[PDB]
Design a protein around this ligand. Sequence first.
Ligand code: CLA
Ligand code: CLA
Ligand code: CLA
Ligand code: LHG
Ligand code: LHG
Ligand code: SF4
Ligand code: SF4
Ligand code: CL
Lengths: 737, 80, 67, 39
Amino acid sequence: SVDNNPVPTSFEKWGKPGHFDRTLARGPKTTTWIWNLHANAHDFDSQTSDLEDVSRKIFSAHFGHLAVVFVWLSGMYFHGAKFSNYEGWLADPTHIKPSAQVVWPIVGQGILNGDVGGGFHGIQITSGLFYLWRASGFTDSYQLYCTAIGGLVMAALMLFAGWFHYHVKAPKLEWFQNVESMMNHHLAGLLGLGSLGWAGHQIHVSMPINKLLDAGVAPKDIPLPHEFILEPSKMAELYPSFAQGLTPFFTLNWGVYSDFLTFKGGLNPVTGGLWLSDTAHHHLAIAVLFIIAGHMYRTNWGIGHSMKEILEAHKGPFTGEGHKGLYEILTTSWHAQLAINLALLGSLTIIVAQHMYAMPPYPYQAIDYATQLSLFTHHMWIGGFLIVGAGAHGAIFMVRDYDPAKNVNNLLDRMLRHRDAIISHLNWVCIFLGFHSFGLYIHNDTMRALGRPQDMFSDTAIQLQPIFAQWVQHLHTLAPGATAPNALATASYAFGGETIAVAGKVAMMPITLGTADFMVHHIHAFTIHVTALILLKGVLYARSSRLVPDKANLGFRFPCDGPGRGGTCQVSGWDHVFLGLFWMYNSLSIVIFHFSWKMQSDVWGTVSPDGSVTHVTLGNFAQSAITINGWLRDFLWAQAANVINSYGSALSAYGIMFLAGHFVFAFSLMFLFSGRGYWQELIESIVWAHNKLNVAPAIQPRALSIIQGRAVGVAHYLLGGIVTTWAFFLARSLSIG
Amino acid sequence: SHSVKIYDTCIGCTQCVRACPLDVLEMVPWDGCKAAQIASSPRTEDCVGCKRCETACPTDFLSIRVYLGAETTRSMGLAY
Amino acid sequence: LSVGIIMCLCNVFAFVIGYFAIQKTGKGKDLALPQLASKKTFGLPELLATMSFGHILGAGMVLGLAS
Amino acid sequence: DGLKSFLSTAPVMIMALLTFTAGILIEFNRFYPDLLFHP
Ligand code: CLA
Ligand code: CLA
Ligand code: CLA
Ligand SMILES: CCCCCCCCCCCCCCCC(=O)OC[C@H](COP(=O)(O)OC[C@@H](O)CO)OC(=O)CCCCCCCCCCCCCCC
Ligand SMILES: CCCCCCCCCCCCCCCC(=O)OC[C@H](COP(=O)(O)OC[C@@H](O)CO)OC(=O)CCCCCCCCCCCCCCC
Ligand code: SF4
Ligand code: SF4
Ligand SMILES: [Cl-]
């Protein structure tokens, strides 16, 4: 069921902007038209009312997005091969910092081409590309160039696939609605076979040059990755399990392969990365479990499961008709699927951030504290943005695609029927958490300021010991040998163990948890609960409330329903997204500040040859992170000295963005604190001045809309704050050393 | 209660009455316009002040005007 | 390498379970038309599913016995 | 002929003019740098 040439390819409609919207195609009258145009481009459900054409547009846009990502990755490989020092870093890891951006000498900006090692002048890259390339077995610039060329070819393939699947041969609706096969094809297909292929790549290619570089072989003396597969004698030379071939695999004797597929745990004490044998065995187990999972649902042969029948069988005495109907929602509404996928992908990116620091999987990434901090913070911010988008598209589904006649006494209807109880209890939880975390900080600030340190909440005072987290850390410490008998080391040394001391620097130690950790974890719980409260109230009240009973008729994105009923501005689901964006921003700023301070205070530093570690901020987190003043002075004021004393050096760009973000945040407050009536009257005065000299434009200038004013405000606020924190974090962690 | 006034530029398009979510306005017969009808507000004690009727009005400098005044349970839109 | 043959032949408990628990057996595109008593009784995809399940429980059983 | 008017759209002309002016300024700096006044 594939259509034949639905949409012709013509250059004429490119030159008439606003073709997709009926109102936009009449032409511009006010400037809002222009601002409507970019606002209305990707809302495919609003332009066309048929689900089929919306699905075609989404499929071709997905191919275009994949093309954009491939262009970005190809550029990264090209900048790592021509304008980088991957050659030179690879022979000497701990004398040379990674640098993959070379900047032209112009207007004095060549100062940013700093000395990174081996006669190189360029920006020290902190994305960790070198450590992943070492973990994959890369050893030459020509192979990185080949990967860049292949990425360009795959981007062209993605563009051609998008053009083909929109304009030439495009599928029908029941192709998209066949989700039973799509989940099997994504589990046993993409994830399972991709991890099987990467496990095969690990075992064959990434393991030999990695273990030879850890042994001490120069990178030029390791010949090339393909000559291993040319001659299997090299594997039996190095891993002596490669003597029986594929025979123990098919004959239930997998213990022969317990030489390159292991269960060690911990880190490799030459690099600080995870064990590559551990990661290959993990990838193989993940592949087998995912192949097994990708044969659950009936696709074409009558064997499997019906997801509809599974959902319809789940109902109880508390939940009425249970999960009746959710298959129809998730097969007809793109927005509902987008909401739940954004939630789980944001949670996954946050899980990735939290798992990557404590179990560093790349060689020499852990001792590069800039790379660790950058990766943690970047993945945290990506996850938080995706969770806000999840709340957004849940509200969008509630406004647009919800139907009450086709959800009667199921779970979703009962959510809507007890949303008051849900939101009121979440409100009480948020107030309780805000008091019993931030007021603990306020209590501590006041008692320290009053000269009563024995009355504070601290380890040397009234103690708040996180005893459950300590007990779980203890159980993880006694895991390898008692509850994990075949595991050699612990899953991570953050739970308890000994300090890995690759080079003179630290990679991981037991992260102890005291009163300050208790306080900051309950701060995290509080802020996550408030962001969840905002987004869940926006979802549950997107259609109606006691204030506005017809909110679904007003849409998802509307400023207000007027000054009446006391005032109803910011009632829409979009405005709940707007507020949840700031609260997610606050939550993640505190999360990454906790991470940066705890890692600099109790983990990172310099190891003495006797076995003692001098930390970066000398363990001040236990006594200073219990007050707001300690966070202001010992964390913000103290560590901002690197970003403000950067001028005249190679880090001075991090100074400039430290100013520049401070601009944009403040600029945001113009849009956030004001309203468009003032700006429209001011625009009237400037139009009168333009009328005097006959320079009045034909498109009439207007103030921005109320929604657009809020959008510009939140965008500039988040941009300025994130750029400020990025500049501060990077100039601190490129000067930690 | 809020005050809803209708001025003589009304052309009887009935859009303010259709836009009103609380049944404040009707259309009564008139002679000042070609439609021969003018909006009226007999039920301003039910008006919440949402100004949807003002948004619907097509006459330049709207013929219907809502003035927020005394605040009641009905006017603040309270279900409690 | 002989007792594992008897264990992954007694894996046919998966076939026995799928005889009396699979909702739809003889429905697929290719359904193994020479039907007989106990080899191709329900169909090709039922046989494939039961042999995969048998291999799964056979691997589990042999690595459980091999302590 | 729609591509000619697609280039004629306002962002394409303003980005082309911005690139032209930026190229002129960058070239005048990389030929003759460090001018604060008229010598
Ligand atoms: C040269 C080939 C060609 C031609 C003549 C057209 C022509 C057309 N397409 Mg089409 N398309 C193409 C390639 C082409 N497309 C490719 C490669 C894809 C895959 C991404 C699509 C996907 C696509 C979709 C999904 C839709 C169209 C639509 C349309 C029609 C309206 C014009 C339009 O979109 O506004 C002009 C728009 C632009 C000029 C936007 C430019 C792209 C912006 C800046 C985003 C950049 C991302 C880009 C898509 C991919 C990455 C670029 C790359 C350099 C990395 C028009 C007939 C639409 C339609 O049916 O109209 C009702 C529609 O819904 N096309
Ligand atoms: C998988 C991810 C995903 C997908 C598929 C969509 C898809 C969609 N979203 Mg959505 N969204 C997402 C993530 C996603 N979003 C996230 C993560 C958030 C949280 C921030 C939101 C928040 C959100 C809102 C609040 C709204 C949408 C809307 C929409 C719809 C139209 C998009 C639009 O107007 O395009 C056009 C997009 C723009 C014009 C935005 C461009 C301007 C951005 C803000 C600039 C960002 C700054 C940039 C990164 C750096 C600046 C550099 C500069 C200095 C040079 C479409 C269904 C809108 C809609 O109509 O709903 C149906 C809508 O109201 N979404
Ligand atoms: C630092 C500034 C600040 C502070 C203190 C608050 C405080 C609060 N906001 Mg908030 N907010 C802010 C900025 C701030 N906001 C900004 C900038 C925005 C814009 C996007 C928002 C947007 C926003 C939304 C959208 C939401 C909140 C919510 C909340 C409440 C969370 C529940 C809670 O913690 O209760 C406990 C209260 C506190 C921790 C406040 C401090 C109390 C101190 C420590 C105790 C004082 C002791 C005593 C009372 C003093 C009396 C003195 C005596 C002489 C009388 C709380 C009242 C949420 C809410 O109401 O959920 C329940 C909610 O939904 N806010
Ligand atoms: C941090 C860990 C240590 C502290 C743990 C504290 C647990 C807190 C109290 C228990 C919550 C019980 C909900 C499960 C019990 C539960 O699922 O009941 C089961 C019941 C569904 O019963 P049925 O048999 O109808 O279910 C059939 C299902 O298949 C659905 O159709 O659900 C309800 O009644 C919904 C009402 C939940 C009302 C409770 C709201 C929960 C708010 C608290 C959330 C706190 C989570 C804290 C831990 C993360
Ligand atoms: C950390 C970095 C900063 C990230 C902060 C972002 C916060 C997220 C804000 C999303 C809200 C917008 C979602 C649509 C919600 C929405 O539509 O926005 C609101 C506004 C129009 O909304 P109204 O409700 O006025 O629309 C009325 C229409 O619905 C009916 O005609 O749209 C705009 O502001 C248009 C201006 C876009 C400006 C176009 C400039 C070109 C920028 C494109 C480059 C983008 C980045 C490309 C990759 C580099
Ligand atoms: S202040 Fe603005 S957003 Fe609030 S009710 Fe009035 S017009 Fe609407
Ligand atoms: S302000 Fe609202 S409730 Fe009052 S008359 Fe106008 S539309 Fe009706
Ligand atoms: Cl202090």
